[PDB]
Design a protein around this ligand. Structure first.
Ligand code: FMN
Ligand code: FMN
Lengths: 337, 339
């Protein structure tokens, strides 16, 4: 198979890399080309399926380049594209031929624009692109997922009594903490909806979804006492709802607008449980489906049945609030006075 | 002293491309405009440069050109210090016919990254695409507090349809609903934020109050036409929508971290629009908005006061949003049909 990917750095060393790649690829019966431009690498590799994946994993863990994204993969090609170039290194910055400068300049402009759009893509779509799968042709599937929903407590009072610059810092830190912990436990963030964070886990990650929920609550608790009382981060609380059910995962829309979405009642149920945590002594609430997806010995606490066809609500004893929810909203209210 | 860079997609030969350059050389040289046009596998890559008044007017005529579509300006440089191609009125480079092997890697990379770019564009929020088309990097724009009309619309009894329809049919139904909503929202100047399940999130400025209501009624209208266009075995026959609108202060911008970025709207109006959207199940109207949206309307609509619901807010609607059916019996009609 042959693959195409772009990367990001972290000079005579890149010529040293080219010398190293020539010797290894010629030994490995693998050909291709490696380009460099303005701090970005462009490499094409081709060979037998088992051989190129062996090499692609070596460069994935390389310290020299970062932010790797496989753009394309063709598993059954008829003939190679560069049948004689073990690894042709092209330092395109050194090239000064004016006839290639337009193609050079357009390559840099689109690639830089491409690296920006990457940051807005859902993690599932980028994953599909890394696997050589076209997101516009892949059929959606019904999967058993654990839905994650979490937002900021008393966020209406915060937006009402905080400058625009302060709330942006507060939400960015909240999104950064949530995205980092969710991704660390193997979860996938779907999208941001206002101050809400939507994520999903597989049915094997039941305990990971609860550990993610507890780590997020714990990191916000650390952050609140890391800053001074004049810092908006001192008032950052969250509630977390989890649900389990059948959802349709895939890419929807038309040629004008596409999006990665999850279709199923478990999505709405997770949002209601997230809003239910305001009336509970616990900052985490999940259904029985999430509870039965857990193998670890959690101290499950039955919170009774609530209607959002009332459904059972559970939680863990570690999700207990050391504060009072209503007194915190009042504390948030009068602190901003 | 302006320079533009845009990519486009062809509409539908080789020798007809040489004419575009021939005309380009005649007009760009009389306009003192230089640039570079690249054609590669059904995509156009053109750089323009020159004075503002004549680059814009030239650029506006290339937009209405029938031969290329989906034009997106990627980069803009105002008050340039020096031209990039000072001698090329318009150098047309057909990369498809060039066969130099030393540029085939660069030619192959540019094609792959651009095709991947066109795919990512479709997933982007409309505001981000708008910012790129103005030459403004979205990751450098600071979030602003603006008064906007928030748009929410989802599918009626969507939980019953997901429980009683095959996956391929649910996808066909949702794709069509998203295709109709996006087209009507965009035609009225609205910006689609994202899709949340079966919900469509959009925003309008405070000067587009009437356009937000005309969008809502046009969506409801096209769903009615579509229902009797198809047969009773088609899932589109059971497609209904409720629409909620809200007006308030929202913080709009690019938020997140290096791991994840998203275009989001922060404000109570976003949550208000979602509840009014879900309020349409208990109303004989498929559209519900607040008094703030009502005050943004200049057209002489027949507003109907639906009382106060929930910190309570007062809900309004228009007479045209009236349903010819009953919402409860439709929920049961949808369920009895899927047997
Ligand atoms: C951008 C980039 C591209 C690389 N491409 C190759 C390659 O094509 N083939 C190869 O053997 N090594 C390539 N390398 C080097 C690998 O990271 C790897 O460290 C090296 O091949 C073997 O290292 P080792 O001998 O210490 O095990 C590349 C490194 C970078 C940063
Ligand atoms: C991709 C593309 C690029 C074009 N670039 C130019 C250009 O740079 N200059 C120009 O005068 N016309 C350009 N045209 C053609 C114009 O749209 C149009 O034919 C011309 O400006 C007006 O010609 P007319 O007055 O004879 O109708 C381009 C057309 C296409 C499809």
């Amino acid at each position: 198979k042959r693959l195409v990917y772009i990367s990001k750095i972290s000079l005579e060393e890149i010529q040293r890399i080219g010398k190293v790649s020539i010797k290894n690829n010629q030994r490995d019966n693998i050909t291709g080309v490696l380009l460099y431009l303005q701090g970005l690498f462009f490499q094409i590799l081709e060979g037998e399926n088992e051989k190129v994946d062996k090499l692609y994993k070596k460069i994935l863990v390389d310290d020299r380049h970062t932010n790797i994204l496989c753009l394309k993969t063709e598993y059954d090609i008829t003939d190679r594209m560069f049948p004689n170039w073990a690894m042709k290194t092209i330092n395109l910055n050194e090239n000064s031929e004016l006839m290639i400068q337009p193609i050079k300049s357009l390559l840099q402009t689109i690639t830089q624009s491409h690296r920006v759009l990457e940051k807005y893509m859902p993690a599932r779509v980028i994953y599909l692109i890394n696997q050589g799968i076209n997101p516009l042709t892949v059929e959606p599937q019904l999967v058993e997922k654990i839905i994650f929903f979490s937002d900021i407590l008393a966020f209406s009072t915060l937006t009402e009594k905080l400058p625009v610059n302060e709330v942006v810092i507060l939400v960015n830190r909240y999104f950064s903490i949530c995205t980092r912990i969710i991704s660390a436990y193997g979860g996938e963030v779907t999208k941001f909806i206002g101050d809400c964070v939507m994520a999903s886990f597989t049915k094997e990650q039941g305990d990971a979804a609860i550990r993610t929920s507890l780590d997020i609550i714990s990191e916000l608790k650390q952050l609140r006492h890391h800053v001074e009382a004049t810092n908006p981060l001192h008032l950052l609380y969250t509630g977390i709802g989890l649900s389990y059910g059948h959802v349709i995962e895939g890419n929807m829309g038309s040629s004008l607008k596409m999006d990665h979405t999850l279709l199923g009642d478990a999505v709405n149920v997770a949002a209601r449980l997230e809003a239910l945590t305001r009336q509970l002594p616990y900052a985490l609430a999940f259904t029985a489906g999430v509870k039965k997806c857990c193998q670890a010995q959690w101290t499950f606490i039955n919170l009774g049945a609530h209607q959002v066809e009332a459904i059972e609500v559970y939680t863990v004893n570690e999700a207990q609030k050391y504060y009072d929810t209503l007194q915190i909203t009042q504390l948030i209210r009068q602190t901003l006075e």
